[PDB]
């Protein structure tokens, strides 16, 4: 909607430890943080690029802006992917944040396709073993079932409490700003301000917005960076701070808040029950691992539980006081001797 809160900002490049191939790089899809706070299993991922905006600050759901060296660039939303152990389903996107549902895995990967149609990826260690809502480790989501509490990341692209800060970026070193016009250094600034310092007497350090030529100096005696930035960016742990006490020029809200909702689970089919004095015998069809528990209803409850994997017979002692038996997500069964 109106998420013009990103207009003064830009995406950025940052350290990625596995850009593919088991090698680290400086990535436009560096991951910052993976959240797994919703008990429904949804993952909320933060990346160094911005999703849903052109480089002109205009909103477009089919576009994604990253940084190509010093210049923000447009790219295809359609090329964005999250992969973990096996490909994920992206539920939501806004700026730096991606809502995805992922299979169980140990790495988490996010990538996209740039304008030149190169794949860019980034991968982090991430144990993803989303623990089970209910008492049945099920694998197909049912219609006929019981609903239970859970938490989710809603798809609200708007106006939350949680915030990240956007600052003045630090100066950007770039060796290609300098070339060796034999015997001298030529600083080529494109259309930018360059802060430079050369370790050779005469025209040592300063600023320039024009192509400047420093005399009688070699390129490995000079340091050049792009300064006077006029777009803001997240003060990432993977980027230097521009000033000692930092800077700050704005804030961006974190979409997709954690809301508290309901999830469906199945109920394991009612077990076949046969009876003897002080004894109950139960056949169990788990369609999937189903938890079985039971307790005496006297002073000594003697809790027992086990996960039933496949079809099974269970023989239970029914004391004078009676027995309570919870079979997965069903309501408890109660038995007394006659």
């Amino acid at each position, epitope marked *: 909607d109106n998420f013009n809160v990103y207009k003064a900002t830009r995406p950025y490049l940052a350290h990625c430890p596995d850009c593919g191939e088991g090698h680290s790089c400086h990535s436009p899809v560096a991951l910052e943080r993976i959240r797994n706070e919703a008990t429904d299993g949804t993952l909320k991922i933060q990346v160094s690029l911005q999703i849903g905006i052109k480089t002109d600050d205009s909103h477009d759901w089919t576009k994604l802006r990253y940084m190509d060296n010093h210049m923000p660039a447009d790219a295809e939303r359609a090329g964005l992917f999250v992969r973990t152990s096996a490909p994920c389903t992206i539920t939501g996107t806004m700026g730096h944040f991606i809502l995805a549902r992922c299979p169980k895995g140990e790495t988490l990967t996010v990538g996209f396709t740039d304008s030149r149609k190169i794949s860019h990826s980034c991968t982090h260690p991430f144990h993803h073993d989303p623990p089970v809502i209910g008492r049945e480790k099920f694998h197909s989501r049912p219609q006929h079932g019981k609903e239970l509490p859970c938490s989710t990341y809603v798809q609200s692209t708007a106006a939350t409490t949680e915030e990240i800060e956007v600052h*003045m970026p630090p100066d950007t070193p770039d060796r290609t700003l300098m070339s060796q016009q034999s015997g001298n250094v030529k600083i080529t600034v494109n259309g930018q*301000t360059v802060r430079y310092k050369c370790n050779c007497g005469g025209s040592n*350090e*300063g600023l*320039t*917005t*024009t192509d400047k030529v420093i005399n009688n100096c070699k390129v490995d005696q000079c340091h050049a960076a792009v*300064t006077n930035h006029k777009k803001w960016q997240y003060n990432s742990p993977l980027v230097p701070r521009n000033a000692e*006490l930092g800077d700050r020029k704005g804030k961006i809200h974190i979409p997709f808040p954690l809301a508290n909702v309901t999830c469906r689970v199945p109920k394991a089919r009612n077990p076949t029950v046969t009876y003897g004095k002080n004894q109950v015998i139960m056949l169990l069809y788990p369609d999937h691992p189903t938890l079985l528990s039971y307790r005496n209803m006297g002073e000594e409850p003697n809790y027992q539980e086990e996960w039933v994997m496949h079809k099974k017979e269970v023989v239970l002692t029914v004391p004078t006081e009676g027995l309570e038996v919870t079979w997965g997500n069903n309501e408890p069964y109660k038995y007394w001797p006659q």
Partner: antibody, heavy 121, light 109 residues
Framework: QVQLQESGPGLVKPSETLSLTCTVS??????????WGWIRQPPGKGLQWIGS???????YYNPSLKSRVTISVDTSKNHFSLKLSSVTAADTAVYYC?????????????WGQGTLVTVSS | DIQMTQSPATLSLSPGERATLFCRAS??????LAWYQQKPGQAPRLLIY???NRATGIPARFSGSGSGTDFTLTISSLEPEDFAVYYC??????????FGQGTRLDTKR
């Protein structure tokens, strides 16, 4: 946001060291501007940039004065300061302290109200 | 070592008129130019920067144009406020930051 006010002796004799204090109001030094600086103006003439102290600690000096100019920041008193050594009558001028808060570029958008410094014996 | 020349030295005009001022650098400074206003006895006041951008709160009648080495300041319709001395500054290649000698906008009568 911030206000700069100069503080100076006014009359300095030759070969002594002119010393000026620009005191900053409404914001701490280390956070209030991208360049602090000193710019002078002799009577009846234009402006001459003397020096600038960048927030990174780099100091940029005018080449015709670098051998005599020191600019420092005292964050314990929110003021930056100029020391111009070995003074002659040409140094007689209105001295301005100035700052650039809004872009990190090399212009000047906040100004003090300059102090006249005369040089004679 | 950038040299800045302003023109004319004196521009004596009546209020409400359009006024135009010229600044020229000894070599290309891209658009890295600024225009400062200074009224007698005061500090310079930043009017224009990067040769076209207007400083915070500067009236919309002020505007700057030009690139390379040749720059124009234009005041759409002079107000009594606007009669002062205008300097141009370079930052295209510094230090040293260098200024022009000024133009004196006198009030005709």
């Amino acid at each position: 946001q911030v206000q700069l006010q100069e503080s100076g002796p006014g009359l300095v004799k030759p070969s002594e060291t002119l010393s000026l204090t620009c005191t900053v109001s409404g914001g701490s030094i280390g956070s209030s501007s991208y360049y602090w600086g000193w710019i002078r103006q002799p009577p009846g003439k234009g402006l001459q940039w003397i020096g600038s102290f960048h927030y990174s600690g780099t100091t940029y000096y005018n080449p015709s004065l670098k051998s005599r100019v020191t600019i420092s920041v005292d964050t314990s008193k929110n003021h930056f300061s100029l020391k111009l050594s070995s003074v002659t009558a040409a140094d007689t001028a209105v001295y301005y302290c100035a700052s650039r808060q809004n872009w990190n570029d090399g212009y000047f958008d906040y100004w003090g109200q300059g102090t006249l410094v005369t040089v004679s014996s | 070592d950038i040299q800045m020349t302003q023109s004319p030295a004196t521009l004596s005009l009546s209020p409400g008129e359009r006024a135009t001022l010229f600044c020229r650098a000894s070599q290309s400074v891209s658009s890295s130019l600024a225009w400062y206003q200074q009224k007698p006895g005061q500090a310079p006041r930043l009017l224009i920067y990067d040769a076209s951008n207007r400083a915070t709160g500067i009236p919309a009648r002020f505007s700057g144009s030009g690139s390379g080495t040749d720059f124009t300041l234009t005041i759409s319709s002079l107000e009594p406020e606007d009669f002062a001395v205008y300097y141009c500054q370079q930052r295209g290649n510094w230090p040293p930051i260098t200024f022009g000698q000024g133009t004196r906008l006198d009030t005709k009568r």
